DNA sequence: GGATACGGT
């Protein structure tokens, strides 16, 4: 069962459609910042007043950090791009050291949790409400 | 397992 990002809470597993806003690779993991243009009180409030950021929106509490480890990292690092639409299935949520929600994909070689992320074609109607909502904020 | 909304590798 799919949730809107407004609906997700810490320390569960969930699934959602989203757009990728920001990527960052490192030698430990791959990070996505993603949104479905719904608000969550535990999301970081992104400021439009920061000087010099490459972030162009959405602002306020509208996006979530996803940390991708191991096979998820290796698969996505050079594949998932800023602007892409994704569907993410059976991922874990937690709270960071400051009280903010984030999503995690741990390594799962034993294939216990059936986690996945894959690209979604821009034309898929599953993305329609994301698109409809994004019009509110541009 | 990383470590704060940047950095744009």
Swiss-Prot record:
Disulfide bonds: none annotated. Single-stranded telomeric DNA-binding protein that is required to protect the 3'-end telomeric overhang. It binds the consensus sequence 5'-GGTTAC-3'. Regulates telomerase and telomere length. Self-associates. Interacts with ccq1, poz1 and tpz1. The gene is pot1. Belongs to the telombin family. The chain holds residues 200 to 337 of 555 of the full protein. This is Protection of telomeres protein 1. It comes from the Eukaryota. It is found in: Nucleus; Chromosome, Telomere.
